[PDB]
Design a protein around this ligand. Structure first.
Ligand SMILES: CN[C@@H]1[C@@H](O)[C@@H](O[C@@H]2[C@@H](O)[C@H](O[C@H]3O[C@H]([C@@H](C)O)[C@@H](O)[C@H](O)[C@H]3N)[C@@H](N)C[C@H]2N)OC[C@]1(C)O
Ligand SMILES: CN[C@@H]1[C@@H](O)[C@@H](O[C@@H]2[C@@H](O)[C@H](O[C@H]3O[C@H]([C@@H](C)O)[C@@H](O)[C@H](O)[C@H]3N)[C@@H](N)C[C@H]2N)OC[C@]1(C)O
Ligand SMILES: CN[C@@H]1[C@@H](O)[C@@H](O[C@@H]2[C@@H](O)[C@H](O[C@H]3O[C@H]([C@@H](C)O)[C@@H](O)[C@H](O)[C@H]3N)[C@@H](N)C[C@H]2N)OC[C@]1(C)O
Ligand SMILES: [Mg+2]
Ligand SMILES: [Mg+2]
Ligand SMILES: [Mg+2]
Ligand SMILES: [Mg+2]
Ligand SMILES: [Mg+2]
Ligand SMILES: [Mg+2]
Ligand SMILES: [Mg+2]
Ligand SMILES: [Mg+2]
Ligand SMILES: [Mg+2]
Ligand SMILES: [Mg+2]
Ligand SMILES: [Mg+2]
Ligand SMILES: [Mg+2]
Ligand SMILES: [Mg+2]
Ligand SMILES: [Mg+2]
Ligand SMILES: [Mg+2]
Ligand SMILES: [Mg+2]
Ligand SMILES: [Mg+2]
Ligand SMILES: [Mg+2]
Ligand SMILES: [Mg+2]
Ligand SMILES: [Mg+2]
Ligand SMILES: [Mg+2]
Ligand SMILES: [Mg+2]
Ligand SMILES: [Mg+2]
Ligand SMILES: [Mg+2]
Ligand SMILES: [Mg+2]
Ligand SMILES: [Mg+2]
Ligand SMILES: [Mg+2]
Ligand SMILES: [Mg+2]
Ligand SMILES: [Mg+2]
Ligand SMILES: [Mg+2]
Ligand SMILES: [Mg+2]
Ligand SMILES: [Mg+2]
Ligand SMILES: [Mg+2]
Ligand SMILES: [Mg+2]
Ligand SMILES: [Mg+2]
Ligand SMILES: [Mg+2]
Ligand SMILES: [Mg+2]
Ligand SMILES: [Mg+2]
Ligand SMILES: [Mg+2]
Ligand SMILES: [Mg+2]
Ligand SMILES: [Mg+2]
Ligand SMILES: [Mg+2]
Ligand SMILES: [Mg+2]
Ligand SMILES: [Mg+2]
Ligand SMILES: [Mg+2]
Ligand SMILES: [Mg+2]
Ligand SMILES: [Mg+2]
Ligand SMILES: [Mg+2]
Ligand SMILES: [Mg+2]
Ligand SMILES: [Mg+2]
Ligand SMILES: [Mg+2]
Ligand SMILES: [Mg+2]
Ligand SMILES: [Mg+2]
Ligand SMILES: [Mg+2]
Ligand SMILES: [Mg+2]
Ligand SMILES: [Mg+2]
Ligand SMILES: [Mg+2]
Ligand SMILES: [Mg+2]
Ligand SMILES: [Mg+2]
Ligand SMILES: [Mg+2]
Ligand SMILES: [Mg+2]
Ligand SMILES: [Mg+2]
Ligand SMILES: [Mg+2]
Ligand SMILES: [Mg+2]
Ligand SMILES: [Mg+2]
Ligand SMILES: [Mg+2]
Ligand SMILES: [Mg+2]
Ligand SMILES: [Mg+2]
Ligand SMILES: [Mg+2]
Ligand SMILES: [Mg+2]
Ligand SMILES: [Mg+2]
Ligand SMILES: [Mg+2]
Ligand SMILES: [Mg+2]
Ligand SMILES: [Mg+2]
Ligand SMILES: [Mg+2]
Ligand SMILES: [Mg+2]
Ligand SMILES: [Mg+2]
Ligand SMILES: [Mg+2]
Ligand SMILES: [Mg+2]
Ligand SMILES: [Mg+2]
Ligand SMILES: [Mg+2]
Ligand SMILES: [Mg+2]
Ligand SMILES: [Mg+2]
Ligand SMILES: [Mg+2]
Ligand SMILES: [Mg+2]
Ligand SMILES: [Mg+2]
Ligand SMILES: [Mg+2]
Ligand SMILES: [Mg+2]
Ligand SMILES: [Mg+2]
Ligand SMILES: [Mg+2]
Ligand SMILES: [Mg+2]
Ligand SMILES: [Mg+2]
Ligand SMILES: [Mg+2]
Ligand SMILES: [Mg+2]
Ligand SMILES: [Mg+2]
Ligand SMILES: [Mg+2]
Ligand SMILES: [Mg+2]
Ligand SMILES: [Mg+2]
Ligand SMILES: [Mg+2]
Ligand SMILES: [Mg+2]
Ligand SMILES: [Mg+2]
Ligand SMILES: [Mg+2]
Ligand SMILES: [Mg+2]
Ligand SMILES: [Mg+2]
Ligand SMILES: [Mg+2]
Ligand SMILES: [Mg+2]
Ligand SMILES: [Mg+2]
Ligand SMILES: [Mg+2]
Ligand SMILES: [Mg+2]
Ligand SMILES: [Mg+2]
Ligand SMILES: [Mg+2]
Ligand SMILES: [Mg+2]
Ligand SMILES: [Mg+2]
Ligand SMILES: [Mg+2]
Ligand SMILES: [Mg+2]
Ligand SMILES: [Mg+2]
Ligand SMILES: [Mg+2]
Ligand SMILES: [Mg+2]
Ligand SMILES: [Mg+2]
Ligand SMILES: [Mg+2]
Ligand SMILES: [Mg+2]
Ligand SMILES: [Mg+2]
Ligand SMILES: [Mg+2]
Ligand SMILES: [Mg+2]
Ligand SMILES: [Mg+2]
Ligand SMILES: [Mg+2]
Ligand SMILES: [Mg+2]
Ligand SMILES: [Mg+2]
Ligand SMILES: [Mg+2]
Ligand SMILES: [Mg+2]
Ligand SMILES: [Mg+2]
Ligand SMILES: [Mg+2]
Ligand SMILES: [Mg+2]
Ligand SMILES: [Mg+2]
Ligand SMILES: [Mg+2]
Ligand SMILES: [Mg+2]
Ligand SMILES: [Mg+2]
Ligand SMILES: [Mg+2]
Ligand SMILES: [Mg+2]
Ligand SMILES: [Mg+2]
Ligand SMILES: [Mg+2]
Ligand SMILES: [Mg+2]
Ligand SMILES: [Mg+2]
Ligand SMILES: [Zn+2]
Ligand SMILES: [Zn+2]
Lengths: 84, 252, 49, 112
RNA sequence: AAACUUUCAACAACGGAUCUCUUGGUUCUCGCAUCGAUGAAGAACGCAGCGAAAUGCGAUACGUAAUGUGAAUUGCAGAAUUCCGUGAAUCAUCGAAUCUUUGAACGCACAUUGCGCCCCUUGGUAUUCCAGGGGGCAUGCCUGUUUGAGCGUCAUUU
RNA sequence: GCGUUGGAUUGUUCACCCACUAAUAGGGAACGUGAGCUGGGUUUAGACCGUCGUGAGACAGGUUAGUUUUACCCUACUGAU
RNA sequence: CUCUUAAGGUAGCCAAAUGCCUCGUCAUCUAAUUAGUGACGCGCAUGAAUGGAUUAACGAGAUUCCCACUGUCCCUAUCUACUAUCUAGCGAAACCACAGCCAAGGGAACGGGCUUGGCAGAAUCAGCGGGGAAAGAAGACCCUGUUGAGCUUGACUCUAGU
RNA sequence: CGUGGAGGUCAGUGACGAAGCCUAGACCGUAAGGUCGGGUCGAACGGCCUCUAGUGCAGAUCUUGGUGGUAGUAGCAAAUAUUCAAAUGAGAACUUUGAAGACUGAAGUGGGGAAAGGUUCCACGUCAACAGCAGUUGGACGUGGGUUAGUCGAUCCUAAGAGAUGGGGAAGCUCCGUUUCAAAGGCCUGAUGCAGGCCACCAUCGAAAGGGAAUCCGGUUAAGAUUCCGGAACCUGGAUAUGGAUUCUUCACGGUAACGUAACUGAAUGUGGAGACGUCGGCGCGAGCCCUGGGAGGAGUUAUCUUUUCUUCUUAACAGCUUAUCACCCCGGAAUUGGUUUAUCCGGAGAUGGGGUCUUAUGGCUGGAAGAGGCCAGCACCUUUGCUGGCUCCGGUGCGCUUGUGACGGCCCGUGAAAAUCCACAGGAAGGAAUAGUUUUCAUGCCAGGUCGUACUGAUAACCGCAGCAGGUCUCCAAGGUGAACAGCCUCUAGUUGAUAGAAUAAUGUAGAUAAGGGAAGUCGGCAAAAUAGAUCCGUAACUUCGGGAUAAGGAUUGGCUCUAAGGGUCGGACGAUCAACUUAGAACUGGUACGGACAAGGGGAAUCUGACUGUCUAAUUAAAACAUAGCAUUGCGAUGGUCAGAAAGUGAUGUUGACGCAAU
RNA sequence: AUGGUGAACUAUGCCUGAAUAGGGUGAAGCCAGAGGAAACUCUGGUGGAGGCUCGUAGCGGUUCUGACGUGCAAAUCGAUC
RNA sequence: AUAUUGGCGAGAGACCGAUAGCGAACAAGUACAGUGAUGGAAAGAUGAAAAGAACUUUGAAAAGAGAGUGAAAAAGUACGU
C-alpha cells in the first residue's frame, strides 16, 4: 500500500520549531531551517518568492524600535525636555 | 543516461569502509634512532583477530626511549609469532621470524613481509594473509635491494626500508569454498558494500552500457581503452589480452 | 509523555486561548466581533507541534 | 494470576531494564529493577578473576573499605598471586644471571 | 371527478441578483531623506478589574516620565479619583525611561529554558564547597598601551 | 410444423477423428449476445529462445505472468397493485 | 573435383520455451489425442562461460498421464445466516440538449423525434439486463503537426575529462 | 437600439416617494427598444446636443456562486447478542442501578509504556451543533479542578555522524579540513605576582532503548504519586569533632600458604582491573507462577452424595550474621592409570585423597517488622461509623511455566562498539612520636542536593490515513483444563456486552452446508470443491552428488473401565526401613464396531519443460523460466598507482587498506 | 530555463537497541560391544550440526482471476497460500 | 540638471464600485492545506435612535399566539432593496 497503510507510519517530525522565525521549518537532521536559513547569518530570501518576501519583510512585525524613527527624524533628533 | 554503479562508488556514501570493529591501523614502529642504528626489543603481548582482515594481528609493546612508559604497536603477525615472544627491531637486529630489520641487513632469499616502500612508511608491501616478499639482490652502491612482490613484479627500494622476517599467518584462507551466498554476505558485511553484484547486462541501457537488448548481450567490445571516460569504463579495462589463459604464467 | 519545555509552553498558550468570546465584548460600541473565529479543538485542527 | 508493569519510562527489554518479581508486605506482587550484575575484577597478568576482592560496579568501589579492594601481599589487587610468585623468581634469577654475564665478559676482554 | 403532472398569478419559501452606498483598491503628480553592536528587521513568550483576536506595550508590560489641551472614560463595574485645577483622559504631543526570551546575536551550547569561567556583595562558622544579589568573557580588522618571541639583527658590558 | 446431439486434440471460428442418431442442413439478428459470463487467444508495462540489427531495439517467428468497473433513471420485457 | 574463406559448425543437443514448412514422419498412450512422451534430423534459424551437454534435490514456476476424490458435469434439488423486501429514523452519488412504444421509408448509407402506417387511457411496486450506438477519460491503436521527451549509434554540432 | 463614466443644456424628476424589483394590465416601433398603470420600495435620478470606453452573452468539457430531477431513492448487512425490572427525565430499544444470557479467554475487548497527540484526564453544569437511528449518555458544549522527586528520566559520556577554529579553495552566496603544514592551554603545591615540577589531551553538538552515583514498603486523591503523608534507607558534594586504631621497633598485627581484618601515611609518574559486550545447544541452580497435604477463619451446595466446592494465611528497599559452583593453597607422589560431565576431558607443568582459603550471584535467620497488610468475630445506636477483641501457622511435590544466572559445549575467510567515569597496583616525593605526635578508605555525629518533564490515550473513537476510516504504527507482564504446545476449543481474574432498530422470510445474490446412480463426460486447464490427515506399530521403489529420495508408496491400531509388570530418592551397617513420581509395555472385561469421536490435521504416483538449491523485484494487474548467489573464468593496478568523486583546493571514496588485496566484466 | 525544498514514505550503508509456540530430522565429537589370521569391518548408545524440515506468531503475497468494486479502504476483506 | 512599482509626508483622477478594485474595504498574509519550500480563502449595508419586543398566554424547550417599539417588523441582530 504505497498509500494509506504506509501513511500509518508517519510519526517522526521532519522539522522542529525554528528558533529565529518560529516556523516549524527547522530541519532536525540538517540543523537548519527552510524558511529563513537559520543558522545562516543573512536571512533567506529570493526574488521569485515575492509572496514569501511580502510575508516576512519589515512591517509584518512589531517594528519596536523602527516605528518612531520617522517621528524622531521629524524633530531634528531632540535631547533634553520641554519646560512649561 | 543515469550514473552507473562504478561512478557512484567514488564520492563514497554507502560505499565507505566498515570501520567499527577494527583493531586500529596496523603499522611498524616509527623509524627512529633505536631501529636505524641499534636494535630495540618488544614483547608480543596479544595476537588477536581483525574484522575485515584475514590476517591475525600481534599486539607488541615496546619501551618508550625518551620518557618512562610503555608504547603499543600493532603488528601484522607473521606465521609463528606467538604470545610473549620477544621481538627485536633495527639495523643491527638479528635474523629471526618476527624481528624487523632494514632490507640491506638481510641476505638475498630472505623471506620478509610488511616491507616499507620508502623507509619510514611503517609498512606497505605484503600485508595480506600469507603474503611475503623475497629479497633477490642488493646494490650496495646507492644502497638498494631487489625484491619480488606477491604479484611477482620486481622493484628497487631503499635498503633502509624495513621489513618483518617471515610470511603472514592465516594463509590458505582462500583455499576454502565460500560454499553458500550468506558466507559471502558476512565477509563483505565487515568489509564494505560491494556485494552482491548485479550484471550490467541485466539492466537497461540507462543503468549501464551493457544495458538493453531483446537478449542480454554486450553487443560491442568489452575491452575498453585506458583513455575511456568515467562511465565508459566497465568490462575489461585496457586489457592487453583476453580469453582463457593457457599454459604457464609466473614471470622472471 | 516527557516533553520539551518549548513545547509544553506553547501547549499552555494553546489551552489559554481555547475559549468562547468574552460575552461582554459583544456589548461594546462599534463592536464587530460576534464569536471566537480562531477557536481550535484537539481533535480537529492539530497545531503542528 | 497477577501480572506486572515496568516501573520506569522504558517499555523495552534492554539491558538496563532488567526486572524482578517481588511479593511485598501488601500481599501483592510487584516489579523491581535490578542493576546489571557485577563481574569480578581481573588479574592484570594472567587475566584471572582475583580472589578475596569484593565485586561491585565501578563507582561502588569508592563507597567501600580499602580492605576489600585488596588482600595483604604486595601487588595486592593487581596480580593473581602465583603470578607475583613468578615475577619474583624471574626477577631474582635474571639479576643473578646478570652478574654471571658481567664477569664472563670481563674475562673475554682480558683473556683475548 | 380527485390524485398527479404542466402553465400563469398572489402570498409564503429558497437564494443573494439588482439599485444605492463606500474609512478600501487603483493610478497620476508634489515634497522629503531617517534602520541597525547606542542590539535593527523578525521571532517566541507575556502584560488588562473583567479579552479569545486585532491594535498596543514589556516583570515600571492596552503601559512609566516629560510637554500641550483643558474635563472626561464608557460594554458593566470602578474610583482618600478631583473640576476657577502642576488637572479628567485609551486625548493629542514626545525631547526621559523601561524594554522579558530572542534574533547580524557575542562565554559554550540550544529537538535542553542544558553546561562554564572571572570580579563586587550578602547569607550559611569560610579566599576554597553551597546559595541569593548586582557586574562581566564572540570574531575580523585599524590606532595606541603593556607584556613578549626569534644567531632576523645592531651596539655594549669584562 | 418439428428436431438437428455426446466426446478425443485444438483458445481457436475452421480443420479432424470417435460414437450415438430420424438426422447429426446451411445461415441471419451490430461477423446476435462482455454494466450476462469467461478470459484461453489476441493487444501495453516483466521474462526466455530463435532469426535481424553495431546499438537502442526489431520480428504477421515460438513462449510464460499478466486488476473484466457502475443500473437506483427511461423504455423494453417478466410478474404485481 | 572445383569455386571460395579469417575460419567454413567440432563435441554435443533437436520439430526442443530454438523447425517456416507443420496438426513434419514413425512409435506410444486413447474409442477417437493440433495435446503428452519416445524416436528420427540438408536443423526456415541447434550448438559449446553469446556457454554446450547432463543432472540428485529443491519449486505457490509452464505442460502430460494415472489412482484417490469430488455438484466440474449429466441435472438439478434442499437448508442456514446476512441481504434484498415492508416499516421508523437518517439520507448521498453518477447522469441529464429535449426527451423517451413500435415497423418500414428515406437521411451523414442502424431514428425517441422527420414520412407513411401499427396505434394510444390516470397513478403505480418487485424484478430484469434487450435498447438508451448508457456512464466512466478532449483514442493510449492509426494518421497529420515543419510539437515533444526516454533511449542508441562512425547522424549533424559540441563538450567535461584525459 | 442599449450600458458605465465626462462637457453642455432642460433654473428637468424626486421623501406629497428617486433607483430597483414584481405584473398571461395599457400604448408606440419591423426591430434593438421606449412609454404607462397597479404592487413592492426607500434616496437619489432622467430627456436632449456632444464626449469617452473595462459598453450589450445561451453556449467556450468557460470563472464564482446559487438550485433541481435522480430521491425519501442507493443505501445505514464484517467483527456470534441480546433480555427483564426500577431509578431519573417533558421524552428511555440506546443513560444509571439491580437482576439474567453471553464475549474478549491472558499472543486480551486485561494491566503499563515508546513515538505522536496536547487537556482528551476529573468534577459540576449541559444537549443548539457533533456522536451518517436515538440521546437524559460522550472523547461534545460551558465553568472550574488537576501533573509535588538529591534517588524515575532528562542533564553527563561517547557511537555512526554532525561541526567552530590557524588554515586551503571559491567573483560570491560559501566549499574543504577536525587533527587540519598553528606561538593553541591548563592543573596542583607552596615559598598574590612569584620559586617550581609538571601534564599538556586544541572546541563543540550528536542516545528519554547504549554507558551511567542513589529508595523502598504502607497509606492517601474526584483527578498525582517510586514525587505526596508515615516509617524505614542510600548517594553525592561540603564541613568538622569525639571515641576507636596506630607509634618509644614510627607509617598494624595475625596465617606455612591461598588468605584475614574495624582501621592500619602516599605527591606525581607509570601500570593494571572492572565501564566492555556474538549466537545457539543441553545440564545445574535461584526467583515469581502452577499444582497440592494438615490445620486456624469467611463464602457456596446439601431430596440424595461429598472429612466436600471457593477463598484469607503476606513480608520492601536497606543492615548483621551466615550461605557457592568456579578458581585457589598446604599435605601427600599416581600403571593394575585413576578422577570425572547428559555432553571426553583432566593429572609428574603434581591427579585421585585429607585438609584449608575466596567471589557473596543466590538462598537461610534476625534486624527492619507487625506496630504494616491480609482474613474473621463481638460490640455500641442515627449523632461518627469510632472500639474492643481475635487468626495471620506447619509442610510436601517437578524433564511443569516464565525469567535470571552459572559451568560448559557447537559456530564462523562473521570472532560479535566507543567514551565519560569508579577502584587498585607499582612507586617512594614529602611529612611524621615520647611529655607526646601522626591517622578522613574503622564507628558516630552536622549542613546542602537546583532546573525541565511527570495528568491521560497509546488506538475497530485520544497518533497518521480529509472522519469516532474493517487500514497502518515500537514494547513488557501472561492463570486452569484438554493437548506435543502462548495452537484450536471451554473456563478464573479484570474488561467488555459498543456496531440504528422493528416486522417478514419472494426472486437474485454474499457467506456456510448436504446430495441418489455416474465419476471430469464440465472446462483453456480439476478453476473450484471433495478426498488426506494426529499418534503407536508394520511396510517402503526408480534414481542419487550416498547427505538424500521418505510422512515416498502402502497397510493395522486407537474409547472407557478393571487388573499386571518395569522403570527412582534418603538414611544407619544377596538385606531392611521409609519417602515421592507418569511414563512405557502387557492382559482381562465392556459398546448399536464406537473411540486423533468437538477442535486440531499431508492427497498420492509416473514424466517432459525449466531455474541448481536458501534468498530477491516491479508498493497499487507481471513472483517467473527474471535478479542474486556459492562455483568458473577474464581484465586493471606495486601507491609517483588502478577505479571513482569535485567549480576549485593544503579536496575526497576504496584506505584503520597493499595482490590470500582493492577495483571492473 | 533558473533558483529553491524534500530520505516522516520507500531504496541502500553505517551506529545503537529490541524480537522469533510446539513438533520432524539426527551431522561431526564420544562410550560400550561384536567379526576377522591380518588389513580392516560391522553393532548399540551418546551427543545435537544444518542460509535442514511440518508449523504458529512474525515478514510475505500464490490462487479463488472469492468479497468489495460511488468500497471499511486512492490497494482493503475472507479463504487458500 | 538625471533616476525612482521601496520608506516618510502630501494634493488629485472622465479609474474600481464588494465575483469589481491590491489576494486582503471585515480579528488578511487571517483561517486552513502541506514534512517542507510554499500555497492561501471566504466574509461589507437593522434603524435617526436599540426604541433589541415589558407584560399575558400554549409549550419541557426551541418557539408559537397576543400585546408592545418604531415613520416602517412588507426593517426582529436569519435584519436595506
Ligand atoms: C444491423 N442493423 C440493421 C440496420 O442497418 C437497419 O437497417 C435495415 C437495412 O439494412 C435494410 O436495408 C437493406 O435492404 C435492401 C432491400 C430490402 O431493398 C437491400 O437491397 C439493401 O442492400 C440493404 N441495405 C432494410 N431493408 C431494413 C432496415 N431496417 O435495421 C435493421 C437492422 C437488422 O437492425
Ligand atoms: C615549501 N614547500 C613545502 C610544501 O610543499 C608543503 O609540504 C607538505 C608538508 O607540509 C606536509 O607535511 C605536514 O602535513 C601533513 C598533512 C598532510 O597532515 C602531516 O601528515 C605531516 O606530518 C606534516 N609534517 C606533507 N605531508 C605534505 C606536503 N606536500 O608544506 C611544507 C613546505 C616545507 O612548506
Ligand atoms: C503509456 N502508459 C501510461 C502509463 O502511465 C500507464 O498506466 C500507469 C501505470 O503504468 C503506472 O503503474 C504501473 O506500474 C506499477 C508498477 C510499480 O508495478 C503498477 O503498480 C501499476 O499497476 C501499473 N499500472 C501507474 N502508477 C500510473 C498509471 N497511469 O497507462 C497510462 C499512460 C498514461 O498512458
Ligand atoms: Mg518507518
Ligand atoms: Mg529525515
Ligand atoms: Mg504552518
Ligand atoms: Mg511566492
Ligand atoms: Mg533639535
Ligand atoms: Mg545522469
Ligand atoms: Mg571510514
Ligand atoms: Mg547491497
Ligand atoms: Mg560472482
Ligand atoms: Mg552478478
Ligand atoms: Mg531487466
Ligand atoms: Mg549507454
Ligand atoms: Mg560502448
Ligand atoms: Mg545489452
Ligand atoms: Mg530482455
Ligand atoms: Mg548473455
Ligand atoms: Mg543468458
Ligand atoms: Mg549480433
Ligand atoms: Mg457601522
Ligand atoms: Mg449602530
Ligand atoms: Mg489534517
Ligand atoms: Mg499535518
Ligand atoms: Mg510536530
Ligand atoms: Mg524474552
Ligand atoms: Mg381532470
Ligand atoms: Mg464605508
Ligand atoms: Mg531589545
Ligand atoms: Mg484594546
Ligand atoms: Mg498632564
Ligand atoms: Mg496616546
Ligand atoms: Mg503637539
Ligand atoms: Mg524593568
Ligand atoms: Mg525550563
Ligand atoms: Mg533550552
Ligand atoms: Mg563567603
Ligand atoms: Mg559556586
Ligand atoms: Mg458479415
Ligand atoms: Mg461479435
Ligand atoms: Mg449487451
Ligand atoms: Mg463484463
Ligand atoms: Mg482479454
Ligand atoms: Mg490471458
Ligand atoms: Mg510504468
Ligand atoms: Mg502469476
Ligand atoms: Mg430498490
Ligand atoms: Mg510439438
Ligand atoms: Mg533438451
Ligand atoms: Mg520430443
Ligand atoms: Mg501428438
Ligand atoms: Mg487430455
Ligand atoms: Mg532441429
Ligand atoms: Mg526447409
Ligand atoms: Mg545457427
Ligand atoms: Mg555460436
Ligand atoms: Mg568458444
Ligand atoms: Mg545463438
Ligand atoms: Mg546447461
Ligand atoms: Mg523459493
Ligand atoms: Mg513456485
Ligand atoms: Mg512440454
Ligand atoms: Mg434492489
Ligand atoms: Mg425505510
Ligand atoms: Mg439519468
Ligand atoms: Mg414508408
Ligand atoms: Mg434505413
Ligand atoms: Mg425503427
Ligand atoms: Mg437516440
Ligand atoms: Mg418534416
Ligand atoms: Mg442495454
Ligand atoms: Mg446510465
Ligand atoms: Mg489525450
Ligand atoms: Mg483524440
Ligand atoms: Mg507541413
Ligand atoms: Mg526530441
Ligand atoms: Mg518520457
Ligand atoms: Mg468603465
Ligand atoms: Mg418607484
Ligand atoms: Mg435612507
Ligand atoms: Mg466586456
Ligand atoms: Mg451578463
Ligand atoms: Mg448564463
Ligand atoms: Mg452565441
Ligand atoms: Mg437534494
Ligand atoms: Mg426520510
Ligand atoms: Mg425509509
Ligand atoms: Mg431504503
Ligand atoms: Mg453493504
Ligand atoms: Mg420505558
Ligand atoms: Mg444499543
Ligand atoms: Mg469463550
Ligand atoms: Mg495506567
Ligand atoms: Mg496509560
Ligand atoms: Mg445523529
Ligand atoms: Mg532531580
Ligand atoms: Mg553529549
Ligand atoms: Mg566544516
Ligand atoms: Mg579555521
Ligand atoms: Mg578560515
Ligand atoms: Mg539511557
Ligand atoms: Mg528509583
Ligand atoms: Mg493533588
Ligand atoms: Mg554495547
Ligand atoms: Mg443431604
Ligand atoms: Mg536499593
Ligand atoms: Mg581433589
Ligand atoms: Mg523437585
Ligand atoms: Mg504522572
Ligand atoms: Mg497514561
Ligand atoms: Mg499498549
Ligand atoms: Mg486524524
Ligand atoms: Mg497432559
Ligand atoms: Mg491454551
Ligand atoms: Mg454484528
Ligand atoms: Mg445443511
Ligand atoms: Mg453426487
Ligand atoms: Mg454416490
Ligand atoms: Mg472410480
Ligand atoms: Mg477433463
Ligand atoms: Mg483449489
Ligand atoms: Mg530415509
Ligand atoms: Mg503412509
Ligand atoms: Mg515426600
Ligand atoms: Mg469389540
Ligand atoms: Mg528460483
Ligand atoms: Mg505489482
Ligand atoms: Mg560450472
Ligand atoms: Mg526513515
Ligand atoms: Mg572382537
Ligand atoms: Mg529453512
Ligand atoms: Mg519450511
Ligand atoms: Mg503480485
Ligand atoms: Mg477480483
Ligand atoms: Mg455492487
Ligand atoms: Mg473582492
Ligand atoms: Mg477576492
Ligand atoms: Mg452603509
Ligand atoms: Mg448602522
Ligand atoms: Mg419599509
Ligand atoms: Mg406592526
Ligand atoms: Mg421584501
Ligand atoms: Mg427595511
Ligand atoms: Mg433567507
Ligand atoms: Mg429583509
Ligand atoms: Zn527559520
Ligand atoms: Zn595473575
Amino acid at each position: 500500500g504505497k498509500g494509506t497503510p504506509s501513511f500509518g507510519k508517519r510519526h517522526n517530525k521532519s522539522h522542529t520549531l525554528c528558533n529565529r522565525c518560529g516556523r516549524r521549518s527547522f530541519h532536525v537532521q540538517k540543523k537548519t531551517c527552510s524558511s529563513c536559513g537559520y543558522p545562516a547569518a543573512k536571512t533567506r530570501s529570493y526574488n521569485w518568492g515575492a509572496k514569501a518576501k511580502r510575508r516576512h519583510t519589515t512591517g509584518t512585525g512589531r517594528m519596536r524600535y523602527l516605528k518612531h524613527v520617522s517621528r524622531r527624524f521629524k524633530n531634528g533628533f531632540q535631547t533634553g525636555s520641554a519646560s512649561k | 543516461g543515469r550514473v552507473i554503479r562504478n561512478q557512484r562508488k567514488g564520492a563514497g556514501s554507502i560505499f565507505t569502509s566498515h570501520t567499527r570493529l577494527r583493531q586500529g591501523a596496523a603499522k611498524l614502529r616509527t623509524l627512529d634512532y633505536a631501529e636505524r642504528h641499534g636494535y630495540i626489543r618488544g614483547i608480543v603481548k596479544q595476537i588477536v583477530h581483525d574484522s575485515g582482515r584475514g590476517a591475525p594481528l600481534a599486539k607488541v609493546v615496546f619501551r618508550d626511549p625518551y620518557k618512562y612508559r610503555l608504547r603499543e604497536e600493532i603488528f601484522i603477525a607473521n606465521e609463528g609469532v606467538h604470545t610473549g615472544q620477544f621481538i627485536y627491531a633495527g639495523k643491527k637486529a638479528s635474523l629471526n621470524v618476527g624481528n624487523v630489520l632494514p632490507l640491506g641487513s638481510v641476505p638475498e632469499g630472505t623471506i620478509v613481509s610488511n616491507v616499507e616502500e620508502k623507509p619510514g612508511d611503517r609498512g606497505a608491501l605484503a600485508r595480506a594473509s600469507g603474503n611475503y616478499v623475497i629479497i633477490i639482490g642488493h646494490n650496495p652502491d646507492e644502497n638498494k635491494t631487489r625484491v619480488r612482490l606477491p604479484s611477482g613484479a620486481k622493484k628497487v627500494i631503499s635498503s633502509d626500508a624495513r621489513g618483518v622476517i617471515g610470511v603472514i599467518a592465516g594463509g590458505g584462507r582462500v583455499d576454502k569454498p565460500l560454499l553458500k551466498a550468506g558466507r559471502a554476505f558476512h565477509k563483505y558485511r565487515l568489509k564494505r558494500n560491494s556485494w552482491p553484484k548485479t550484471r550490467g547486462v541485466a539492466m537497461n541501457p540507462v543503468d549501464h552500457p551493457h544495458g538493453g537488448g531483446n537478449h542480454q548481450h554486450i553487443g560491442k567490445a568489452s575491452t575498453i581503452s585506458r583513455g575511456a571516460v568515467s562511465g565508459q569504463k566497465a568490462g575489461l579495462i585496457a586489457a592487453r589480452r583476453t580469453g582463457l589463459l593457457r599454459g604457464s604464467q609466473k614471470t622472471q | 509523555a516527557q516533553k520539551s519545555f518549548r513545547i509544553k509552553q506553547k501547549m499552555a498558550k494553546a489551552k489559554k486561548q481555547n475559549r468562547p468570546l468574552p460575552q461582554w465584548i459583544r456589548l461594546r460600541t462599534n463592536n464587530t466581533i460576534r464569536y471566537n473565529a480562531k477557536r481550535r479543538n484537539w481533535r480537529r485542527t492539530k497545531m503542528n507541534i | 494470576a497477577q501480572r506486572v508493569t515496568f516501573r520506569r519510562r522504558n517499555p523495552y527489554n534492554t539491558r538496563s531494564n532488567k526486572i524482578k518479581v517481588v511479593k511485598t508486605p501488601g500481599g501483592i506482587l510487584r516489579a523491581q529493577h535490578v542493576k546489571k550484575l557485577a563481574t569480578r575484577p581481573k588479574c592484570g597478568d594472567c587475566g584471572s578473576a582475583l580472589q578475596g576482592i569484593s565485586t561491585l560496579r565501578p563507582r561502588q568501589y569508592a563507597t567501600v573499605s580499602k580492605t576489600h579492594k585488596t588482600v595483604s601481599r604486595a601487588y595486592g589487587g593487581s596480580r593473581c598471586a602465583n603470578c607475583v610468585k613468578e615475577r619474583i623468581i624471574r626477577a631474582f634469577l635474571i639479576e643473578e644471571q646478570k652478574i654471571v654475564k658481567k664477569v664472563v665478559k670481563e674475562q673475554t676482554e682480558a683473556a683475548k
